Design brief:
Binding site for Ca(2+): 312, 316, 406, 461
Strand content: 25-35%
Pfam family, one: Fucosidase_C
Function: Alpha-L-fucosidase is responsible for hydrolyzing the alpha-1,6-linked fucose joined to the reducing-end N-acetylglucosamine of the carbohydrate moieties of glycoproteins.
Number of domains: 3
GO cellular component, one term: lysosome
Bound molecules: calcium ion
Structural class: alpha/beta
Organism: Phocaeicola plebeius (strain DSM 17135 / JCM 12973 / CCUG 54634 / M2) (Bacteroides plebeius)
CATH architecture of the largest domain: Alpha-Beta Barrel
Strand order of the largest sheet: 6-5-4-3-2-1-8-7
Helix content: 10-25%
């Protein structure tokens, strides 16, 4: 007791918190959406909300399949949630087989039902349904498997999730049933915004219970990561959430473990790990981030008739995410009895076999100077576009450069990011394809590093060239509009064994800014510059120089 480095405010957290290296090193986790919503097997965690909305397809489905809302409520699925085939060790063997490094079971979704040993919430999996501590058994299994344990909380939305049950006859109108939460209106605001309009989305009781909920998860299971759904960022909840963050980060100091909080918006990108959709951006993000997707094409939780995705598209996206400083949190949805389907076991096993061969380029890597090259919205056709071998993503680790082609070719590729205009004194020492015993034939040209693919595929899906090089490389510059000027961003990598001095020069509309940078041996860094007196960002004339060699000019 006594540890109080962190106070429940933003400036205190930012003063003392750093995103841990294990998260950056890990890259890949498995999300497991499993709960009472698995029983109807409709494929929606929002079953509990829409079943009470008169006329909604789920409402109509429920009334015919299970009965009127006054006789069969969401709570009445819970006795059926027996989980006769749940086995935590079996789950962890599937997770471990994927090559993932952490696991994120759902500790509590929006529906009010705790999947763990809760003291205040009598709607829990120890007392009801499975009659076991699902989260506790998964924590023990994860320790034995040698992975890191996280979990997700979606309880904040329980404050309003059952609001439609008050508008039509149903058991939600019996306000003594606490599973159904505060029955408030959903907060206003579209998408990821802290604005809530005239409905706060929480109240005093739900805020206090959120602290009881997160405190007991922290105290009982000491998770290394806690993921939260989107409404914890609405303005009225932020004081409560900062109290949670301080308690979690202070506890973690005592545990001698560094921890991660995920949120979708509302909090600084340095005091937590953003969990965000993948943009259209090719850019490397400065801070580590996470993005989530399901193995199922249709759903996250289990539904009959699910069509699962192919390992190829998942792996291609995974590599793209990793090249841009992201982690992939990939979801499986077990059946209500606790069985992970053969199809999803197979997808995870294929990813794991890919990582067995190619993981050197993934685990522990960091973004290079630039994440991607190659050709890769509103199309009024089905174009059937796929990646080609010329679509390349980059990572670096231990001064090695990994160039990952997202498809195969019988010919060659030319790595354009190693074109001579980006390079000073670059010499290639070796090139190999991970998993290949064949010697790679390659040649440096002015246009880049030409690399001939070997004869046999070591793996499907994506193919890694490991490149050992010396020299200094700069990325192509990025331009961002600032008032009366422009911000220029590059990354520089010194692959030499000795420190290097580099000069960058941005000449925009005749205004010249220069910076000299000492880049430590076998290291890389962001460099930002700013040109002034730019009348028009769209009409600007731009030249960028790397040690007085022209790297870029907006020629077209
Ligand atoms: Ca591919």
């Amino acid at each position: 007791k006594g540890t109080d480095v962190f106070k429940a405010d933003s400036a205190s957290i930012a003063q003392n918190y750093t995103i841990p290296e294990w998260f950056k090193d890990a890259k890949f986790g498995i999300f497991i959406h499993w709960g009472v919503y698995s029983v109807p097997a409709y494929g929606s965690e929002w079953y509990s909300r829409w079943m009470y909305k008169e006329g909604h397809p789920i409402n109509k489905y429920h009334v015919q399949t299970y009965g009127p809302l006054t006789k069969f409520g969401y709570k009445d699925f819970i006795p059926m949630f027996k989980a006769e085939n749940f086995n935590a060790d079996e789950w962890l063997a599937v997770v471990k087989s994927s090559g993932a490094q952490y696991i994120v079971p759902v500790a509590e979704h929006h529906d009010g039902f705790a999947m763990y040993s809760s003291t205040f919430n009598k709607w829990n999996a120890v007392d009801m349904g499975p009659k076991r501590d699902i989260i506790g058994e998964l924590k023990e299994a994860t320790k034995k498997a040698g992975l890191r344990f996280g979990l997700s909380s979606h309880r904040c939305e329980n404050a309003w999730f059952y609001e439609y049950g008050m508008e039509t006859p149903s058991d939600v109108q019996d306000t003594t049933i606490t599973l159904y939460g505060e029955r408030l209106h959903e907060p206003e605001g579209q998408g990821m915004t802290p604005y809530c309009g005239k409905y706060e989305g929480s109240n005093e009781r739900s805020r206090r219970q959120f602290l009881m909920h997160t405190y007991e998860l922290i105290d009982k299971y000491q998770p290394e990561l806690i993921w939260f759904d989107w409404t914890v960022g609405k303005y009225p909840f932020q004081p409560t959430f900062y109290k949670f963050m301080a308690y979690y980060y202070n506890s973690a100091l005592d545990w001698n473990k560094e921890v991660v909080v995920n949120t979708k918006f509302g909090y600084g990108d340095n005091i937590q790990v953003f969990d965000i959709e993948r943009g259209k951006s090719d850019r490397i993000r400065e801070y580590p981030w996470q993005t989530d997707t399901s193995v199922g094409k249709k759903s996250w939780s289990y539904c009959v008739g699910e069509e699962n995705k192919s390992p190829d598209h998942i792996i291609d996206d995974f590599v793209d995410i990793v090249s841009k400083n992201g982690n992939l949190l990939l979801n499986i949805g077990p059946k209500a009895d606790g069985t992970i389907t053969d199809e999803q076991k197979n997808v995870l096993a294929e990813i794991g076999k890919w990582l067995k061969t190619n993981g050197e380029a993934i685990y522990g890597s960091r973004p290079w100077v630039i994440a991607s090259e190659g050709h890769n919205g509103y199309m009024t056709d089905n174009t059937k576009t796929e990646y080609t071998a010329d679509d390349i993503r980059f990572t670096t680790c231990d001064n090695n450069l990994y160039a990952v082609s997202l498809a195969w070719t019988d010919g060659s590729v030319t790595i354009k990011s190693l074109a001579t205009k980006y390079c000073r004194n670059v010499e290639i020492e070796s090139v190999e394809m991970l998993g290949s015993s064949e010697k790679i034939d390659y040649k440096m040209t002015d246009e880049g590093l030409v690399v001939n693919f070997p004869k046999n595929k070591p793996t499907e899906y994506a193919h890694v060239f490991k490149i050992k090089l010396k020299g200094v490389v700069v990325s192509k510059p990025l331009y961002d509009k600032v008032d009366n000027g422009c911000l220029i961003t590059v990354r520089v990598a010194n692959h030499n064994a000795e420190d290097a001095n580099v000069t960058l020069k941005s000449v925009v509309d005749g205004n010249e800014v220069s910076t000299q940078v000492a880049v430590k041996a076998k290291s890389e860094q962001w460099v930002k510059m700013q040109n002034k007196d730019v009348k028009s960002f769209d009409d600007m004339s731009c030249k960028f120089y790397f040690n007085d060699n022209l790297t870029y000019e907006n020629e077209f």
